[PDB]
Amino acid sequence: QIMHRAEDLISAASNRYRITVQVANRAKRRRYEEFESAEDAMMKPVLRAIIEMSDELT
Amino acid sequence: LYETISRIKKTTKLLSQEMGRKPTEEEIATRMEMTIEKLRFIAKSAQLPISLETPIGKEEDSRLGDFIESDGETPEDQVSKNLLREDLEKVLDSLSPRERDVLRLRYGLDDGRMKTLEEIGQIFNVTRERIRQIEAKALRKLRHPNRNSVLKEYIR
Amino acid sequence: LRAIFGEKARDVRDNSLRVPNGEKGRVVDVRLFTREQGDELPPGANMVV
Amino acid sequence: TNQFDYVKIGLASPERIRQWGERTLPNGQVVGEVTKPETINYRTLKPEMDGLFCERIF
Amino acid sequence: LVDDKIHARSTGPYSLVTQQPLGGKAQQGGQRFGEMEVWALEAFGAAYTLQELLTVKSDDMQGRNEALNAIVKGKAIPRPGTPESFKVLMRELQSLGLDIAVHKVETQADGSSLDV
Amino acid sequence: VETFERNKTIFFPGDPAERVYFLLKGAVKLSRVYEAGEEITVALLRENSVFGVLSLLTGNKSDRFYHAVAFTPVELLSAPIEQVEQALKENPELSMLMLRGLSSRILQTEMMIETLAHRDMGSRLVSFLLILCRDFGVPCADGITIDLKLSHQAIAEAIGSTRVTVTRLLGDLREKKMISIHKKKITVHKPVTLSR
Amino acid sequence: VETFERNKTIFFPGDPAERVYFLLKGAVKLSRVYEAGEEITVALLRENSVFGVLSLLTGNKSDRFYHAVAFTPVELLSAPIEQVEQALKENPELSMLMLRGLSSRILQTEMMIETLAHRDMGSRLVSFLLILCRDFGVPCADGITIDLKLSHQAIAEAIGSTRVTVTRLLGDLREKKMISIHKKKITVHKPVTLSR
């Protein structure tokens, strides 16, 4: 689940920083790109970013 | 004025003698030669300022002046405005792009209030009979509902 | 934005006094203070309420 | 961030001190100096013109 | 009582001199983040927050605003600048027999300048 | 007793303070707005009297759909909607009062009717010219003139004119015999007689 | 439920007769009347609905100076002057009926007035033509047409042309491809859209 994904995400990746930031900017793009595509009000671009980086990417 | 003030003090004290606490003011003006308006002015005029940081009081925790702001303004206003800018911009900037120039030329939308139709008439293309016409035209155009009804809420 | 509405706007800030927030409750009283009403105020004030 | 790297602590020689307030104008004649210790005027409140709040030099 | 202690501030009035929100209890104040508080931020991992918290919600003046905006727009926020109270410190110090050269060293010719 | 100046509006469309007003004095002509542009005034009033039926058209949800005008330096009173809502809800006379004033603005329309959109831009210009002299006219020697300080092309709103106001009227001013001007004045000589 | 022959009258000035004339069917016009050789037909109505503004204008003592018209085969009900007097004298509800009506016609003037006020034989019609299909129109395929035979000059009365405008009506069908015509059928194609 996203929670365990969020865990697995950084349970087997680069510096926990290093990750984040790239999670971050990603979502940044996930927000910039697809700007207000699917409302996303619920699945924050960050959340997206995470899942698509903690499961999709994995 | 320092003397006048003092002189008033003494003279008013004389009034106080007869009229205790000299409640008389305009009556004191019969001896003060001027409405209390200046008497009270004098009062404030003769005020000595405050450290800006006398420790506040009821608590030595802090100085004064640390509960106010400078001549600046909160973003809340800043933004709203700046919205205005563009809000407008587009909304204007959707009718006769050329004329839109003069809309900003003979007016603001930049840094003149102004370019007196005179100068402006020729500024864009040298003109005398093509200006206040398109001027009103522009306004009445972006005026009336659907058009002016966009700043109807953002009247900033 | 006048021009458009050509509203010859007004000129007067309007510092009403408003209940701030999180208060209720009946009003008990008022106590006006001016030249006539005691005139208990800083030098140059008119009314105090 | 990318405006400078290191700071340069030191002293202000009288030129550098006087180089903190020259505001030379196009009339061509220098200012920045204050010829008055008093503050805003009593009648109006404006900043004298050579006191602690002279505008033309601040 | 509870109401006696409740507060919030999206944003509000700032300081005079130092523009950082006017935090005193009655009136839209703001939570002060003293060193030991920052000692809980940089002690943690990813500390942007820190940064920004240090500025855009307190000082890059323009920074403040336009952030604010920038969210109202619907996107992220722009990179900050330098807080104020620095610039202030310059001043003082400068006002006291200094020659502060905060300054860059750019070009392949490495270029030494200074700044506002 | 609200009012404005010789160059102002009372309001726009979209603006929901639509209750019956009370032009206390001055015309305060209302310039019904349009999409692209061109605003009749149509409305034009007297002492005491009302204008701007608003909370009355599409109920109290009516949009003026007609911009207004502070034509001359205004003078206009108004009243809490209740007066034409609650206070009107009462005896007919109350409502009738407002209805009588509405009938004034209505009569006004009939007056424009026929005189306006007649056919020629000269006859028409006069069809309501004498009417005008009967509204804000100023009788003086020559006869029942107006005198109000006016355009050549507000006038054009009288026709769809360009120079007719300054050219054709000149005729009536002299070549034709009907009025005269003092910088910006009107001296209707007459109700009919010469120029009829 | 009174009615009169098509293109007849409901009265002439001088004979206001039964003040009210609740025009029911047909869908019928009041031509005004006056010195002007032209007599604009202003009133035009619907089911159930009123005329009768006689025993009221200028507080009664006011003739129906607008010689009336039994425009199409009429259909019109009425009611004695007193009938409305007592009625309106009592609760307004029974006549709120009647002031909502008023509104209908009061507004019925301002609109089409915005059209007639267009001093031109062209647009004035394109706007006016819409109004028609919006009242006694007949929607059918092409779109919201009227279907009532058009008497050419019947639309030249609000303009002032002679016969050029009569071949301009052709435009509607030809160049305008905006209506059609079938022993005087009338086929507004559109709210706008073969010629806006």
Curated annotation (Swiss-Prot), chain B:
Protein name, per record: RNA polymerase sigma factor SigA
Portion of the full sequence shown: 235 to 390 of 390
Annotated DNA-binding residue span(s): 117-136
Subunit structure: Interacts transiently with the RNA polymerase catalytic core.
Region (Sigma-70 factor domain-4): 91-144
Region (Sigma-70 factor domain-3): 3-78
Organism domain of life: Bacteria
Role summary: Sigma factors are initiation factors that promote the attachment of RNA polymerase to specific initiation sites and are then released. This sigma factor is the primary sigma factor during exponential growth.
Family stated for the protein in its record: Belongs to the sigma-70 factor family. RpoD/SigA subfamily.
Compartments reported by the entry: Cytoplasm
From Swiss-Prot, chain C:
Superkingdom classification of source: Bacteria
Subunit: In cyanobacteria the RNAP catalytic core is composed of 2 alpha, 1 beta, 1 beta', 1 gamma and 1 omega subunit. When a sigma factor is associated with the core the holoenzyme is formed, which can initiate transcription.
Family indicated by similarity: Belongs to the RNA polymerase beta chain family.
Function: DNA-dependent RNA polymerase catalyzes the transcription of DNA into RNA using the four ribonucleoside triphosphates as substrates.
Protein name as annotated: DNA-directed RNA polymerase subunit beta
Natural source organism: Nostoc sp. (strain PCC 7120 / SAG 25.82 / UTEX 2576)
Range covered out of full length: 788 to 836 of 1131
From Swiss-Prot, chain D:
Assembly behavior: In cyanobacteria the RNAP catalytic core is composed of 2 alpha, 1 beta, 1 beta', 1 gamma and 1 omega subunit. When a sigma factor is associated with the core the holoenzyme is formed, which can initiate transcription.
Function statement: DNA-dependent RNA polymerase catalyzes the transcription of DNA into RNA using the four ribonucleoside triphosphates as substrates.
Family assignment from sequence similarity: Belongs to the RNA polymerase beta' chain family. RpoC1 subfamily.
Stated name of the protein: DNA-directed RNA polymerase subunit gamma
Species the sequence originates in: Nostoc sp. (strain PCC 7120 / SAG 25.82 / UTEX 2576)
Native organism taxonomy: Bacteria, Bacillati, Cyanobacteriota, Cyanophyceae, Nostocales
Gene this protein is translated from: rpoC1
Parent-protein residues present: 6 to 63 of 625
Curated annotation (Swiss-Prot), chains F, G:
Organism: Nostoc sp. (strain PCC 7120 / SAG 25.82 / UTEX 2576)
Domain HTH crp-type: 119-192
Database matches in SUPFAM superfamilies: cAMP-binding domain-like, Winged helix' DNA-binding domain
Domain of life: Bacteria
Role description: Required for full expression of proteins subject to ammonium repression. Transcriptional activator of genes subject to nitrogen control.
Name this polypeptide is given: Global nitrogen regulator
Segments of the chain annotated as binding DNA: 152-171
MF GO annotations: DNA binding; DNA-binding transcription factor activity
Keywords for the protein's UniProt record, in alphabetical order: Activator, DNA-binding, Transcription, Transcription regulation
Any one GO CC term of the record: cytosol
One Pfam entry name: cNMP_binding
